[model samples]
Target chain A: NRINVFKTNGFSKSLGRMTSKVLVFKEMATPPKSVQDELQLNADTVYYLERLRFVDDDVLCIEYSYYHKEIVKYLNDDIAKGSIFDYLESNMKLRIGFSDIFFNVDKLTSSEASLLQLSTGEPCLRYHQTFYTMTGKPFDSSDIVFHYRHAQFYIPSK
Target chain B: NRINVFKTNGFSKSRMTSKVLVFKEMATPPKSVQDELQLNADDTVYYLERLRFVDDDVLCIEYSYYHKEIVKYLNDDIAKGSIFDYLESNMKLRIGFSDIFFNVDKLTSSEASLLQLSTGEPCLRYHQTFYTMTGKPFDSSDIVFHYRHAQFYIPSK
Candidate 1:
């Protein structure tokens, strides 16, 4: 029988910071009877309680944080200067109206940001996909969605 | 002496549709000293007319025409449940965010846009840059930009 596990760790805090509203919505919604039946779980088992003790935020950090390497490379090379439209026209292929704009970490040096190493021991490109919707939504839309997966690769710079 | 050349032929009607306000601002007073400098008659001229007239709206036409390929591809493939982010991330090397989103016309396709292969070439990738000021009253800010030309390169399928 399938089980629906609800585990609460400090990850909720991080998720809250990244997407607070979504988390709240997810929390408030009751599991549908169909889903409970599919998972073979009692409807009463939907909520779980966590202990009162709080640990350092880092305790919940399991996955390594990543940034888009290709964007860092462009920013480091002084190549990321132009109208957003002009930049897109010349550098990469885009099928949508909006482009991903990276947040500038002022403390990071250019060399640090441009490091192309991936945690998986393969060269990786750092980037995030951003979508522009007519309604001002910033996520994948059915009509204009591009899927991207992170993997390791190499860049031979001349 | 610094000389500025304006190509009338290069003016894009589509781009102008968005930039008409800026153009009108340039045409009005404080009537620019540069505007008055263009002389019409046979008098000894200090400045030359740099404007040229062409039928095509270069920037908008080229941009729109090229972008159509990407739009068509996305509409067709996305309808079939394709994932853009996956294709972008799986490239041989990590591509720029702008590169992935803006240069869709440069990506692969099973078919070509035009019938005449010799006349019309496939689209390619391109780049863009942005600059902004931090404080209000926008002073002491500058921007220098570059666009890496999209060379025709197709990956083997």
Candidate 2:
């Protein structure tokens, strides 16, 4: 049960996700300032920043994702309407690669507080993720936030 | 930095890492865990404590909490090996969303000795949350290791 969660590539595929909703979206110039250097955007291209909500009876995961607009430009608003993994797998053909998920606990920012519905000064789990293609091109980077105390994130021995 | 404990790609080595001594019977969770999993004192979580050795060096001290209600279907032979291998291959349960994190802390004498590290040295803390297709938190754990750094690789479509 624990090992499979971390091992699986797609969230909707992993959890047998039934429903997901997009919470926020902002279209911007190539390389948003926050991750400009992180992704090394060389061209003045279109960028996208959006929030995704994955529902779980025990825990709620909100994905704060930023991506190259062209990657999903063909995806249109459908990318915002449902699971990116499903869109990528069913609608688009792309290889989902390995994920380096890092975790840290931080004092919730007022903005984070508002989104997570937490009062200020609470500690929330920060999941730093970067998504890549089979060719090693990084298309999306995200800061996934969760309430630390609500549910324990488990990984079992494989 | 290639220590991707979470690696699903063929990248992770099941080599150097083999189950070693320090196996346990049934035990309960500590305060750091009980506060979240909410397993009652009578819940009797399937407790197992063992070490993985890489060519005779202590790789990490592994701890696990497998809720009996959900995992009793697994037998002792498979339980001694991998719970995940049986779930997908045998039971065929599709896993879902996951929460994974890395943190660090100064090690206590007991933990330092367990991971074969020097006292007060830095250690890596891995906390994982794995849910089922139906939204059940089936397994949760805290793994402590002497190695302090790990790099990650994830692919996007």
Candidate 3:
């Protein structure tokens, strides 16, 4: 057996650059029951609500994320505008480990639709992900709703 | 680095089972399929469709084509279970790697019925191509998964 490579149909071609806009960034937001169950955290968390869009302003997805405040330590608006994983590894020198990811199709709620600029009943891709640090501590959890027409996931396997 | 674990009906072990609905040999397949297979227009292939289930619940449906030249022989029996397992154990085929593309789409009426869903329901659709030990593409597939029941797990380093 060997490793597999995952790619989009338009492999190697640009989908244009992407950018993130932070809607909410909180340093000590209490974790919701869902996030608490997923991350196994009962304490306050670093919460980020973000909308991701392509360079041309087409919205791609909206994400709600939480990081275990004890492990992550700190976050700011600047870091919220970019990759948090990058900052955790490059700045904090923390080792990122594996993740548990779940995918499904779902309909958009009114609030979700408003943020995604879609109709209330529009179908979208939903993702639930829980990330752990190398030390086996669950440090992050997120729920993302993506425009079904825009998001494509790739997977390569052995 | 982070690893993602993506699971499939046949590839990942679970309380899952499958059944072959149809299998046939085709001399003239669709042009688009030929392009995905990276085959010349003259190549013949075997086409198979199967259903995946988790206990009694329908979860996914898979349609695949195998290059006749590479597969040499395939039958209803082989189609009933994991072909990759048979290919490795009986035919000495080494599955080197695969390319998979996943997207979301609405299901056809027929497909929706099979998955026990209403019409116009969205699904997780994926196109995959499998290669051999030497990296030669030999099989291709289009799989549609029941949105609520289907989940992909990828374990990566």
* Highest TM-score scorer: 3
Stretches of candidate 3 off by over 4 Å are: A1-16, A42-45, A48-56, B1-9, B12-14
Best by lDDT: 3
Report the TM-score of candidate 2, chain A only.
0.78
lDDT of 3 at A48: 53
Q: How do the residues B1-157 of candidate 3 rate in per-residue lDDT, one tens digit apiece?
A: 1113343323534465788999998898778778877788788989998898876678789898998888888998878777877787788877787777777778889998999988878887888788887887888888888887776544434
Name the better of 2 and 3 by DockQ: 3
**DockQ versus reference, model 2:** 0.10
- For candidate 2, give the lDDT: 0.57
Say which candidate scores most in DockQ. 3
Candidate 3 lDDT by residue in tens digits, A19-130: 7788887766677777777778765565655545443466777877778877887778787776666678778877777666666777789998888877887778887667
Over B23-127, each residue of candidate 1 has an lDDT whose tens digit, in order, gives 111112121222232222321211111111123221111211111111122222222221223223332222222101122221223112221122122232222
Candidate 1, residue A57: the lDDT equals 23
Candidate 2 Cα deviation (angstroms), residue A8: 5.0
Instruction: Rate residue B144 of model 1 by lDDT.
Output: 11
**Which residue runs does candidate 2 get wrong by more than 4 Å?**
A1-5, A43-46, A52-59, B1-4, B7-157
